[PDB]
């Protein structure tokens, strides 16, 4: 990064060279960065210096450029000056953002400027340094020869020998952060460089501030202090340039122009200020009186205070502030200006500070704005609505998606790709962009609340696992856990007023993006915290009752299930050839026919399993059956295809999974016992298929309120138990083969040890201890083998025949110390393991329980009401079809209502955040704070008062001396 | 690593080290108790004003009557004016 | 010349708290000596003679722990590669140890 800014700008000595001076500039002084300087011609463009400064190095773009000019006192220049220029310059320009351009070296105000952004820095944790630029010609650097490497990108080590003034050479200041030197090629004299200053301010001046630009051009100000002679040559070629100006109190050179617009005398004025060349002086500022509009004084003011509204005031004499305010991001300014009752602002002045408050980052203009005020419908030019999406870093993700969707003003499109009342698009556009409190703000006025805003956390989470960086994937995160705090909290009052209006808010059809109920909006968005309410999980049991009472208890339900003539009775109460769509079409009863006949199917196939399994020929209920698993096959493809990713959204589940396990199991059963010598197998295969049928009433009753929850959390223990499986096959192994090595028995086949190995330790861990198979003490001894050694006789067909009987109590140890560890340790340790993963993991399991609960409750509720015995009348009626192939006042009247409740709620949520303790101490320790800016007047006007009484009564003294010669 | 790796890597470093300090600086300045000692504070010097205000007011009933004496002595001068 | 790092080892040795978390403060190289630093405190607090210079130095090493845990964490929290590079450095702080 070193190269093209050797080559593009130039330096001339007269040959036009590249230049050789750049880069870091490091001093002596620790804590602090590297400075930036360039080697650079006059005769060139600020154009690239503006390029190469807001874009190579690094700047921002200014609200606001300010040049000091003044200097007639060397050494000292005056307090009250001083204090100005540490408080009252320097807290604009850090407010504002700002870049204060004076001169680099330390002659004249250099040093009184550095001085007082050196004390602002120190005086107070700002967390930034005011950009204040220098210029400087080349020629009266004091050691520039540390300076002049043309290598690129480094620190070069600037000295202070400290030596005193000539008026050859000057030093560097060093509180600047940037430095820019100007070859001119003389090395002799100050003066020419004001030529590249005026240029660069003119062209400052011409650009605008924005993002993508489109808002005021920069405003640039003048300040004159003390000066002499020949700064009104600068005056006089910055007024032609429309450049407004400011005049402080000061001394005499700048008072020069100060009594010229207070008010021959004036040939006077020109030979007691400069003391030299009158008349060519006195042409000269009555230049200066020609272009009297651009002028203001800085004389009867607060001082180093209130500075602000003094450049607006310059600004207006030589004159749009509303959008001042907007870019220099200050509220005050104007809040104050839309309390003058004077202007009658109109509202296309207030559309245009709104595009500047909505463009930028600036939530609280655009409260303030249209809490004045304004239109939206006329606002919205589909010209504003395309700018709006111009603000874009372009390195974003919207950015690349806007791009995709243009490949293929385009918003319909992008949401497709992810899925006049117009503050529903701007909720949507602060939404892309990552803005926080613009769609909190544009939430809060919109209607349609409790949809939007599961909509809103919706998009945020799937625009959150699509995004790139972790910082903004966190970012949105935490903005869709607010949306969803908000939905749940406005969901609770409107539940809590009514029930059956609430009723009526969550189940409307088509709210948002096409049919999708804001049930299935917090379906997809993994709002678990939702639907962990009392209002909705209320919803969720009337829906699964249809059209009974919630009240009812299950055994009536039983009751009138097997009497069908006690339907029309009086223990159903109903409304939350009539009574028999009303009860068999509630999702309980398509659930209780569901539970009867699957039921029946296991007894059906334990009858075929158990007691009639004819070897030759299938039975007549044999073929019942396997007509019955032809429909539950039938079922299965029915919800895997009722056209590939479907297969892959049956094949993601588990149970859709299990349930095909059960039957491809079947059918190799069947397979397997048809062929004639393969009998005993399809015999065995059946009854591990009758397991895995009877696993599935597991599932099923998930639905259930008391049995839900419970059934759920046992896979979550499945860790403990893999590790016990762990612990107790290390011991298994290490008990078995030492007590099969000690005592070693004559029956010697394989699956025989594999048995007095594996399969003795197991069982002795649930109370079954053989004792008569290894100790002697038990046994009858005797000669039972042929080698050396002394031998027993066991007793059962599996301790082998014989067994040693040497150091058999070695044995007995192995048995205690096993007992010890199998059980006493592990299984107590068990028993600890569970203890605390339940009682941790039990309340996220209620989180997920509820959630899922209204997917199972769905599943019930489109399913024809039939029983899977009889449920090909359904199947065929759906073959027969495939060879063929609220009102609007209502919905005013329940919105108006929604919007009422929610309007008492933010009127809630602000006075009980009003009334907190962090924010009284927060609005005391302001009003202490103006309290004592109150007192400064009174430190001020007691030794003015002090004055002014003895000034009254030193003229009392005078009447006491005229007094005196009235003798 | 090599010196440049090294480099830029120790600034990266540095950078997230300076947000860093700010970020605390900030929220302890924003504590209520650090909020409870400046109030504190500043009515403390907001009593030190308040000495003057009880200092001036004798010295202007004094002030006030000084030149009223006087313009009582301007009013005996009215009365040495008969 | 960054002497801020001789300033630091100075002021761990004398036992000064504010001392060394301002030239912390200063200095670069930050993690890792945040990580010599609490190495440091602890190996002369197990050395030290009176029990309350010595659990004056044990609160000093969990201050300094603290702080290379944080600043660890918005390291890592911006980049991942970039912070794997920077635990994985070969000798920081005396000799070949990360």
């Keep these: 990064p070193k190269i093209f800014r050797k080559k593009v700008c130039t330096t001339f000595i007269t040959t036009e060279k590249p230049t050789d001076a750049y880069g870091d500039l490091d001093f002596t002084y620790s804590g602090r960065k590297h400075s930036n300087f360039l080697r650079l011609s006059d005769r060139t463009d600020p154009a690239t210096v503006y390029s190469l400064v807001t874009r190579s190095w690094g700047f921002r773009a200014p609200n606001l450029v300010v040049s000091v000019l003044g200097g007639s006192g060397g050494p000292v220049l005056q307090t009250w000056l001083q204090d100005l220029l540490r408080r009252g310059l320097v807290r604009a320009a850090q407010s504002t953002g700002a870049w204060i351009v004076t001169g680099g070296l330390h002659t004249g105000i250099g040093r009184h400027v550095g001085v007082a952004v050196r004390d602002h820095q120190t005086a107070s944790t700002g967390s930034s340094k005011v950009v204040a630029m220098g210029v400087a010609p080349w020629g009266v650097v004091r050691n520039r020869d540390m300076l002049i490497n043309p290598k690129g990108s480094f620190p070069a080590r600037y000295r202070w020998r400290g030596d005193p003034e000539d008026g050859v050479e000057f030093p560097l200041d060093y509180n600047y952060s940037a430095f820019f030197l100007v070859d001119d090629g003389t090395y002799g004299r100050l003066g020419g460089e004001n030529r590249f200053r005026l240029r660069f301010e003119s062209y400052v001046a011409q650009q605008k501030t924005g993002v993508g630009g489109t808002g005021i051009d920069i405003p640039v100000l003048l300040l004159l202090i003390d000066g002499d002679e020949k700064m009104l040559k600068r005056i006089e070629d910055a007024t032609q340039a429309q450049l407004p100006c400011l005049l402080v109190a000061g001394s005499g050179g700048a008072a020069d122009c100060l009594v010229e617009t207070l008010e021959e005398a004036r040939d006077r004025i020109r030979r007691y200020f400069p003391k030299g060349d009158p008349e060519v002086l006195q042409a000269q500022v009555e230049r200066i009186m020609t272009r009297k509009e651009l002028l203001t004084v800085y004389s009867s003011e607060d001082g180093s205070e209130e500075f602000e509204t003094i450049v607006l005031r310059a600004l207006v004499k030589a004159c749009d502030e509303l959008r001042l305010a907007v870019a220099w991001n200050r509220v005050d300014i104007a809040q104050s200006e839309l309390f003058r009752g004077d202007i009658q602002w109109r509202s296309f002045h207030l559309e245009a500070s709104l595009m500047d408050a909505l463009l930028n980052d600036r939530?609280?203009?655009?409260?303030?704005?249209?809490?004045?005020?304004?239109?939206?419908?006329?606002?919205?030019?589909?010209?504003?609505?395309?700018?709006?999406?111009?603000?874009?870093?372009?390195?974003?993700?919207?950015?690349?998606?806007?791009?995709?969707?243009?490949?293929?003003?385009?918003?319909?499109?992008?949401?497709?790709?992810?899925?006049?009342?117009?503050?529903?698009?701007?909720?949507?556009?602060?939404?892309?962009?990552?803005?926080?409190?613009?769609?909190?703000?544009?939430?809060?006025?919109?209607?349609?609340?409790?949809?939007?805003?599961?909509?809103?956390?919706?998009?945020?989470?799937?625009?959150?696992?699509?995004?790139?960086?972790?910082?903004?994937?966190?970012?949105?995160?935490?903005?869709?856990?607010?949306?969803?705090?908000?939905?749940?909290?406005?969901?609770?009052?409107?539940?809590?007023?009514?029930?059956?209006?609430?009723?009526?808010?969550?189940?409307?059809?088509?709210?948002?993006?096409?049919?999708?109920?804001?049930?299935?909006?917090?379906?997809?968005?993994?709002?678990?915290?939702?639907?962990?309410?009392?209002?909705?999980?209320?919803?969720?049991?009337?829906?699964?009752?249809?059209?009974?009472?919630?009240?009812?208890?299950?055994?009536?339900?039983?009751?009138?299930?097997?009497?069908?003539?006690?339907?029309?009775?009086?223990?159903?109460?109903?409304?939350?050839?009539?009574?028999?769509?009303?009860?068999?079409?509630?999702?309980?009863?398509?659930?209780?026919?569901?539970?009867?006949?699957?039921?029946?199917?296991?007894?059906?196939?334990?009858?075929?399993?158990?007691?009639?399994?004819?070897?030759?020929?299938?039975?007549?209920?044999?073929?019942?059956?396997?007509?019955?698993?032809?429909?539950?096959?039938?079922?299965?493809?029915?919800?895997?295809?009722?056209?590939?990713?479907?297969?892959?959204?049956?094949?993601?589940?588990?149970?859709?999974?299990?349930?095909?396990?059960?039957?491809?199991?079947?059918?190799?059963?069947?397979?397997?016992?048809?062929?004639?010598?393969?009998?005993?197998?399809?015999?065995?295969?059946?009854?591990?298929?009758?397991?895995?049928?009877?696993?599935?009433?597991?599932?099923?009753?998930?639905?259930?309120?008391?049995?839900?929850?419970?059934?759920?959390?046992?896979?979550?223990?499945?860790?403990?138990?893999?590790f016990f499986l762990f612990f107790l096959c290390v011991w298994l192994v290490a008990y078995g083969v030492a007590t099969e090595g000690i005592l070693r028995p004559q029956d010697r086949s394989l699956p025989s040890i594999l048995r007095r190995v594996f399969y003795r330790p197991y069982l002795q861990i649930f109370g079954q201890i053989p004792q008569e198979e290894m100790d002697v003490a038990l046994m009858i001894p005797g000669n039972c083998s042929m080698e050396r050694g002394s031998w027993a006789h066991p007793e059962g067909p599996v301790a082998g025949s014989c067994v040693s009987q040497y150091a058999n109590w070695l044995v007995v140890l192995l048995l205690i110390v096993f007992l010890l560890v199998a059980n006493i340790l592990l299984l107590n340790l068990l028993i600890a393991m569970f203890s605390y993963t339940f009682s941790k993991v039990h309340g996220n399991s209620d989180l997920y329980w509820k959630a899922q609960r209204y997917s199972l409750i769905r599943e019930f509720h489109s399913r024809p009401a039939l029983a899977p015995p009889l449920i090909i009348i359904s199947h065929v009626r759906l073959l027969i079809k495939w060879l063929r192939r609220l009102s609007k006042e209502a919905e005013r009247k329940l919105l108006t209502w929604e919007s009422v409740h929610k309007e008492n709620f933010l009127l809630a949520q602000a006075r009980d955040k009003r009334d907190s303790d962090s924010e009284r101490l927060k609005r005391t320790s302001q009003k202490v704070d103006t309290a004592l800016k109150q007192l400064g007047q009174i430190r001020e006007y007691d030794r003015r008062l002090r004055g002014l009484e003895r000034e009254v009564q030193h003229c009392s003294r005078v009447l006491t001396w005229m007094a005196e010669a009235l003798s």
């Design 363 to 722: 939530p609280e203009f655009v409260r303030l704005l249209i809490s004045h005020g304004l239109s939206l419908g006329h606002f919205l030019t589909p010209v504003r609505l395309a700018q709006l999406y111009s603000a874009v870093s372009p390195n974003s993700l919207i950015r690349n998606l806007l791009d995709q969707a243009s490949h293929a003003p385009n918003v319909g499109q992008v949401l497709r790709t992810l899925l006049q009342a117009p503050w529903s698009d701007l909720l949507i556009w602060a939404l892309l962009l990552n803005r926080a409190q613009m769609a909190i703000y544009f939430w809060e006025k919109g209607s349609n609340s409790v949809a939007s805003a599961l909509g809103a956390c919706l998009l945020l989470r799937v625009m959150a696992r699509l995004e790139s960086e972790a910082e903004e994937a966190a970012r949105r995160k935490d903005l869709a856990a607010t949306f969803e705090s908000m939905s749940v909290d406005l969901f609770g009052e409107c539940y809590h007023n009514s029930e059956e209006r609430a009723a009526r808010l969550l189940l409307r059809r088509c709210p948002l993006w096409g049919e999708a109920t804001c049930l299935q909006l917090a379906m997809q968005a993994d709002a678990r915290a939702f639907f962990a309410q009392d209002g909705v999980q209320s919803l969720l049991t009337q829906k699964w009752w249809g059209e009974m009472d919630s009240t009812t208890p299950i055994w009536a339900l039983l009751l009138a299930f097997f009497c069908p003539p006690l339907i029309y009775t009086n223990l159903i109460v109903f409304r939350k050839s009539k009574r028999w769509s009303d009860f068999w079409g509630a999702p309980v009863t398509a659930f209780l026919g569901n539970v009867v006949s699957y039921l029946l199917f296991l007894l059906l196939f334990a009858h075929v399993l158990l007691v009639d399994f004819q070897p030759t020929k299938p039975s007549v209920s044999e073929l019942l059956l396997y007509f019955w698993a032809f429909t539950l096959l039938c079922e299965e493809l029915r919800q895997g295809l009722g056209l590939r990713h479907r297969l892959h959204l049956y094949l993601s589940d588990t149970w859709n999974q299990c349930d095909l396990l059960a039957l491809t199991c079947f059918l190799l059963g069947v397979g397997c016992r048809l062929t004639p010598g393969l009998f005993d197998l399809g015999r065995t295969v059946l009854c591990l298929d009758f397991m895995i049928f009877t696993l599935r009433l597991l599932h099923i009753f998930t639905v259930n309120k008391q049995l839900g929850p419970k059934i759920v959390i046992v896979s979550k223990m499945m860790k403990d138990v893999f």
